[PDB]
Amino acid sequence: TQAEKTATDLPPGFSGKAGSVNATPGTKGLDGPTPLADGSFDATIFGPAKELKSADDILNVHRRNAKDPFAVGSVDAPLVITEFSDFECPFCARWSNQTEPMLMEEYVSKGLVRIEWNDLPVNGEHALAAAKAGRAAAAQGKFDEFRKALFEASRNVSGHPNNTLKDFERFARNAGVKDMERFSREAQDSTYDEVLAKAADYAHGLGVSGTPAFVVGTQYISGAQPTEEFIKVIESELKKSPTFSTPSSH
Numbered sequence: 001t002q003a004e005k006t007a008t009d010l011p012p013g014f015s016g017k018a019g020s021v022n023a024t025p026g027t028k029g030l031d032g033p034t035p036l037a038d039g040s041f042d043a044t045i046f047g048p049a050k051e052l053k054s055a056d057d058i059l060n061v062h063r064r065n066a067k068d069p070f071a072v073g074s075v076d077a078p079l080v081i082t083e084f085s086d087f088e089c090p091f092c093a094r095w096s097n098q099t100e101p102m103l104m105e106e107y108v109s110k111g112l113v114r115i116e117w118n119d120l121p122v123n124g125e126h127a128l129a130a131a132k133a134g135r136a137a138a139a140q141g142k143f144d145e146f147r148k149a150l151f152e153a154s155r156n157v158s159g160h161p162n163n164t165l166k167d168f169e170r171f172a173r174n175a176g177v178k179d180m181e182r183f184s185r186e187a188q189d190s191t192y193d194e195v196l197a198k199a200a201d202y203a204h205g206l207g208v209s210g211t212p213a214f215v216v217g218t219q220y221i222s223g224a225q226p227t228e229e230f231i232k233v234i235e236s237e238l239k240k241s242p243t244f245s246t247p248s249s250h
């Protein structure tokens with residue numbers, strides 16, 4: 001027949017990008033995290049939106065907190081990816097270097113997906129120090145840039161980079177962190193000790209057993225799986241839940 005047909009539903013295995021093409025992008029929180037009173041950002045943010053008591057509560061892991069400097073993408077994006085990660089972990093590096101850029105260009109920059117970082121140090125003293133440096137960067141609104149710079153420096157490393165203070169200071173400089181006195185102080189002192197302990201306890205309480213780990217909407221993914229697998233799950237979740245509406249009672 002001499003017509004172009006409107007797309008109709010297909011089995012999910014062959015649905016391609018039907019999910020994202022029919023989803024409604026978020027329009028709020030496009031200018032990054034909301035600042036604190038003094039202009040800096042709340043780098044003590046961690047944890048879920050609300051306690052999880054059963055599998056029914058899986059969406060509670062997604063904060064959708066507009067003040068969150070550990071998040072990228074619209075606060076009302078129809079899909080959130082919650083990530084648990086370690087800055088010394090080569091699988092975390094691989095996901096950051098090889099999967100996340102595609103997700104950023106295809107989904108996050110289009111308002112469809114929000115990605116929220118959660119600390120889960122599994123690799124000991126260098127991982128803890130890196131997480132502290134990450135929070136120091138987030139306090140100055142440069143977490144994503146710090147994350148990207150650190151992991152790019154690990155793009156050819158199959159083991160742990162064993163980054164130390166001068167490495168973190170370099171990543172911070174490259175990320176455009178403006179107050180290096182504050183960064184170097186907070187990256188080393190007790191400022192974030194408590195929140196990092198609590199963040200680890202939270203992740204362990206979920207039973208997250210290794211890094212990276214993801215909650216993609218309602219779906220759990222363990223490890224740096226192929227990029228194509230992340231895309232399939234993203235599309236499936238967007239097909240299922242194309243829109244998000246912030247509750248009026250919040």
